């Protein structure tokens, strides 16, 4: 069969990109923005940096900055109440994950009123109706939510964090500049980083990959590998780099899906507040083990990119390498190595496994896993 | 400054990417197409192969075959009046660049009417308005341009091929199945193919080059370069990687720029008819000589995924065998290897030195060039 490529229409990059916002809305005549953030950044002053521009430019502009970290059913309902009373013609999400993921939750609800619960949307949304137009303008250097055609919620009520795909997501533009991104602290740049990570290397070895998925993917590695730690070190080039290597990664994974890192973090959010970036981190390489025979060549091109000498390894030596080259960002840039250190109890075990057999991420896994499978590397990851 | 990259917000990929065709239409209710080609598509049964398709799934659609190779103004005059004579109401373009370029110039003037005209269109087209909503569809390994935010024209009159470049015109939807592209001759895929890894060179090379530009440029390179042969002597497994290769380009050097390759094959086409590929593969080798020595490491790059053992060489060694790698490739397609071959006179070549200085495209090139300095370069290459 053949492959679909969802991509942003348009995006801008580099230091300085959210300049071009003003035009972007100038250029296709809307009214009113409903922004979609957290009150963490209004108050350092980001959302502001987006917003004193639209004042300038003479642009209509209102705020729910109502969204919490892993944005549950409730937080959506309110944005769409809020925006459907906005007089909002679109709307702006700057954020990460989190206030993107609601953004494009609330933009599908708008016009797909059909969908007001908000859980039947999980899956393949069947959603007759593309989004209310979205600027996504990430601040984090991570979830490649301005690119993807997936946003997670969380349902408090079933504490399980679920996934909605839909390509009626899809943002018109995103501004992904580092200078939005400056604000984040050392362990927000070492998790989002992360987060991307494992989003290139499971989109490397997904099922769905193909050609293009493997250049991209490959790519967004190598540029995350010599970025992330000198971005968790400050320097604000890396911080740019990072930015990129993240949308580079998102370009891949979302048209391709990911596989079981993802599948078992997830529960890990919704059970224990797990910052998402870190889960992953743990995860990762204990996957990457449990995935290393079912990738062909893929772990040698992996160690390669991470500035391992492979050259002359066997195949056997590339698939460590890589899996050590990981361990090792981990630990170098401050991820904590064990499960236990984050409080997972192993008395969950057998739920979080089942949640992770069934979250719709694991499909996209090489090897097939079973609920036991599953309950080892987390036994083995704690 | 910041950089934009524009893409098509949704393209299939893959022997059958046609299959999906009737799906998008009727995903986003559009009525009736006006199929833009060649009488010779028509003919081959190509054309069919998508017309058939949209009679069995139940869709209407017009055709205007009228346009003809580096398409003229009143082609795309013609053409537009029978668009706004048949209630189409998007546009399916199925061809090489050029039914696909006269497609888009259909889609914007039919929605810019100011532009009436089709000179008032060159450079950075000041449109208002988003082009008729395209479906684009190539049966080259060239052009690119379901995916390139401008198209080319040729004035009769001033007789010069000129560049429109716009945003506005990015298709919709761009299907990409070297099931489209199987009829090409082995000069035609020679000849479109080449004219990818020219834009796969120029836009790794121009002014405007950047991070993620370089990476997409330098995954097209590694592509055409390792197919072309194959595509050009009969391999299927080869058409379908090339038929990737050149869209991978268009989504590189159309956000960035060409150089003084077009530049100087745009007065070519215009001048002689000289097919667009086989001006640009002529050229080529001569202007990245000329080029050289303001391409940083890049020659490095390009001559090592053209398979050249760059190993132990000084950035000189290596320049050369970029050059090399490029006459090497164009002997074993079958492109002549002098312009005097293919009728170009001795006579015309200021007029043609100051066309090609003229031609937007040519600013983009990393080393400025004179009248003079074309000159030389349109003489050496006799
Ligand atoms: N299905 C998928 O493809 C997948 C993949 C990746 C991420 N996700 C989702 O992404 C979400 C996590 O998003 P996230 O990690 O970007 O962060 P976030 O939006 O959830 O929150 C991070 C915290 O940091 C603060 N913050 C954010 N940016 C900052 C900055 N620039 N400077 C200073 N402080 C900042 C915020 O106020 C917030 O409290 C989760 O809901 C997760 O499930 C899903
Ligand atoms: N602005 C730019 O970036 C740039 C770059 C590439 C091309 N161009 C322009 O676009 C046009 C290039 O078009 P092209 O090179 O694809 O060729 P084309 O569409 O102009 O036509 C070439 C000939 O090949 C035939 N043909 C095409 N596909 C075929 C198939 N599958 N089977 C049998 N015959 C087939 C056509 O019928 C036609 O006779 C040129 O006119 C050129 O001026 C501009
Ligand atoms: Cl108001
Ligand atoms: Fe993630
Ligand atoms: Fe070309």
Partial sequence: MANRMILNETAWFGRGAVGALTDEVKRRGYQKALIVTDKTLVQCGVVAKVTDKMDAAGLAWAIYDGVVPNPTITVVKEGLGVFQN???????????????????????????????????????????????????????????????????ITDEEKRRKFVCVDPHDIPQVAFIDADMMDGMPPALKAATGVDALTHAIEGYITRGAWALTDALHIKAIEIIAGALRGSVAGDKDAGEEMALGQYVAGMGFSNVGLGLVHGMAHPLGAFYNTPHGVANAILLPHVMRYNADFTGEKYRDIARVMGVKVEGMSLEEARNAAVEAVFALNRDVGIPPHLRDVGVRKEDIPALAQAALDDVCTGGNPREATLEDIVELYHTAW
Avoid at 93 to 120: H, L, W
């Fill in 86 to 152: 906005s007089g909002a013609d679109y709307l702006i999400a700057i954020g990460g994950g989190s206030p993107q993921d609601t953004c494009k939750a609330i933009g599908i609800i708008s016009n797909n009123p059909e969908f007001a619960d908000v859980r039947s949307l999980e899956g393949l949304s069947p959603t007759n109706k593309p989004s209310v137009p979205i600027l996504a303008i990430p601040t984090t250097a991570g979830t490649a939510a301005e690119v993807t055609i997936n946003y997670v």
